[PDB]
Design a protein around this ligand. Sequence first.
Ligand SMILES: OC[C@H]1O[C@@H](O[C@@H]2[C@@H](O)[C@H](O[C@@H]3[C@@H](O)[C@H](O)O[C@H](CO)[C@H]3O)O[C@H](CO)[C@H]2O)[C@H](O)[C@@H](O)[C@@H]1O
Ligand SMILES: OC[C@H]1O[C@@H](O[C@@H]2[C@@H](O)[C@H](O)O[C@H](CO)[C@H]2O)[C@H](O)[C@@H](O)[C@@H]1O
Ligand SMILES: [Zn+2]
Length: 241
Amino acid sequence: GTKKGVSAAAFSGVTAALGDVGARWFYTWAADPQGITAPAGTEFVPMIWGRDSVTADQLQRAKAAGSTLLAFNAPDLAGQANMSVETALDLWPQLQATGMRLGAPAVAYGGDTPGGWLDRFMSGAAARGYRVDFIPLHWYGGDFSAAATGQLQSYLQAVYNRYHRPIWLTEYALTDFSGSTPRYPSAAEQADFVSRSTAMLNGLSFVERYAWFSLSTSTTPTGLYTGTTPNSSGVAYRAAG
Ligand SMILES: OC[C@H]1O[C@@H](O[C@@H]2[C@@H](O)[C@H](O[C@@H]3[C@@H](O)[C@H](O)O[C@H](CO)[C@H]3O)O[C@H](CO)[C@H]2O)[C@H](O)[C@@H](O)[C@@H]1O
Ligand SMILES: OC[C@H]1O[C@@H](O[C@@H]2[C@@H](O)[C@H](O)O[C@H](CO)[C@H]2O)[C@H](O)[C@@H](O)[C@@H]1O
Ligand SMILES: [Zn+2]
């Protein structure tokens, strides 16, 4: 399908890597490709990252660079967009006025929680008569067993059951952030999870698109590629339909 994509940053071999892994789409957490030349058949999706990202110029650049728009990145985290639901709702009309297919802010967690960030945003948007076309999500598993794919499926199903919007998964991996430093799975554990998770996501009718975090090991130790060379996880992602 056209589901499989990646997050990416400019590096010697990014064009080659995107082509090799067979990404149907990519995003950069910015309003344009940030120096990346996309291969043929790989769609760029612009992002409006935070409060100060909302200008007439940025919105103009986003609409010139693609046809779908992602809203604020993890507004529920102090270290990301760090935004109230009210601030997000008050800026919303400027994003809506581009006429582009429009994704909700992507919450770090608690998407299905009554009274949580996403729940208050979607209920506020409905009350104001706003348009929200789809809901992008982040998910990071701290259980590194075969059970992980089932845990991810339960979260996506729960957010779909609550809001009945199609789902994007714009960041996912195995990472435990609970401790004082991040904990990662073994190479074989991560590769097995790539295979099982991609098969499940390809088969789930209400999931439109997904993006492993992330393409390159220069971004994150959960990276799929070092330069133009895939590791065992990159090999599994390339194999996915
Ligand atoms: O548009 C104005 C706005 O730009 C912001 O800069 C962003 C970065 O915040 C963003 O950072 C990404 C993280 O959010 C994510 O969690 O991890 C990835 C991988 O390391 C980061 O790239 O990256 C994009 C592209 O480089 C930047 O445009 C400023 O932070 C913000 O202060 C400013 O208002
Ligand atoms: O900025 C750190 C990264 O954290 C990710 O979310 C984490 C959740 O998975 C976890 O359940 O809770 C913690 C909060 O204590 C989150 O940090 C974000 O989704 C990532 O975008 C982010 O890079
Ligand atoms: Zn207000």
